[PDB]
Amino acid sequence: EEVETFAFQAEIAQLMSLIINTFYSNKEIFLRELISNASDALDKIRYESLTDPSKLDSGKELKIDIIPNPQERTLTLVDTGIGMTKADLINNLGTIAKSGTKAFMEALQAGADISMIGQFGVGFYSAYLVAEKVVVITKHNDDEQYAWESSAGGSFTVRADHGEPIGRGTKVILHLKEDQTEYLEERRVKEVVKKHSQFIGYPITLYLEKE
Numbered sequence: 001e002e003v004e005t006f007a008f009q010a011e012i013a014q015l016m017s018l019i020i021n022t023f024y025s026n027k028e029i030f031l032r033e034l035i036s037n038a039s040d041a042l043d044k045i046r047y048e049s050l051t052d053p054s055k056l057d058s059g060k061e062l063k064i065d066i067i068p069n070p071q072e073r074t075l076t077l078v079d080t081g082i083g084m085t086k087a088d089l090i091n092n093l094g095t096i097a098k099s100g101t102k103a104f105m106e107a108l109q110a111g112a113d114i115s116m117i118g119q120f121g122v123g124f125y126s127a128y129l130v131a132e133k134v135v136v137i138t139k140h141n142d143d144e145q146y147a148w149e150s151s152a153g154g155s156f157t158v159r160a161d162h163g164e165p166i167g168r169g170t171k172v173i174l175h176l177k178e179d180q181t182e183y184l185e186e187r188r189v190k191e192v193v194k195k196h197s198q199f200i201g202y203p204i205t206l207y208l209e210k211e
């Protein structure tokens with residue numbers, strides 16, 4: 001329905017710019033970071049479901065799917081985790097992300113590298129190592145389905161999403177940069193998952209292209 005546009009916190013915009021502009025070849029770390037976030041979301045619904053089993057009425061299966069689409073030049077990471085509320089998307093996550101962004105930037109000035117971003121809690125933004133645009137479809141039990149989108153440049157949008165219901169969880173859609181299409185290829189995604197995400201406690205299914 002109505003699209004609302006918001007500015008990132010200045011610190012978050014600055015982090016995104018650093019991610020986009022810094023020469024840094026080891027871009028594959030984005031996948032570990034997004035998988036980690038998906039795992040954390042799954043952990044949360046699992047834990048909440050032990051005191052309120054009805055929280056799984058929106059979907060019992062706790063899983064991560066990684067879906068390449070070469071025709072659309074997208075890599076999608078779908079989880080059936082807890083999902084994000086409207087307040088999470090617009091304000092609350094970025095509020096928390098300020099402190100870790102500051103710590104990370106400081107660590108970079110003192111000699112850390114970009115692969116340490118997850119040690120600071122702000123690994124989502126590493127998506128911009130490979131994506132020109134990120135679309136996030138999300139649904140929490142206590143809210144409606146939303147679509148968040150950002151092509152960086154200091155702004156993001158949020159709108160009620162009337163597309164296909166996802167039930168519960170989050171779908172991170174990476175619109176890949178032209179030179180980052182290796183991350184649509186079978187061997188490559190498998191190699192990266194095996195290297196950095198081997199012990200995640202939820203089934204990770206790596207889909208193949210149909211063509």
Ligand SMILES: Nc1nc2sc(CNC3CCN(C[C@@](O)(Cn4cncn4)c4ccc(F)cc4F)CC3)cc2n(-c2ccc3c(c2)N(c2ccccc2)CCO3)c1=O
Nearest residue numbers: 037038041081082083084089093096097121124136148170
């Ligand atoms: N696949 C996912 N499923 C989920 S479902 C959910 C709610 N569930 C909560 C999530 C955070 N959990 C951890 C934590 O509270 C830890 N913490 C507390 N104090 C300091 N750190 C936290 C909060 C803010 C934050 F930036 C990182 C964090 F790790 C608590 C449960 C968040 C979430 N995320 C996620 C994780 C991360 C993020 C963002 C999103 N951000 C984002 C925002 C808008 C649009 C796109 C992405 C930006 C910052 O990063 C997923 O990708």
Ligand SMILES: [Cl-]
Nearest residue numbers: 008009012094
């Ligand atoms: Cl923000």
Ligand SMILES: [Cl-]
Nearest residue numbers: 048055141142
């Ligand atoms: Cl819930």
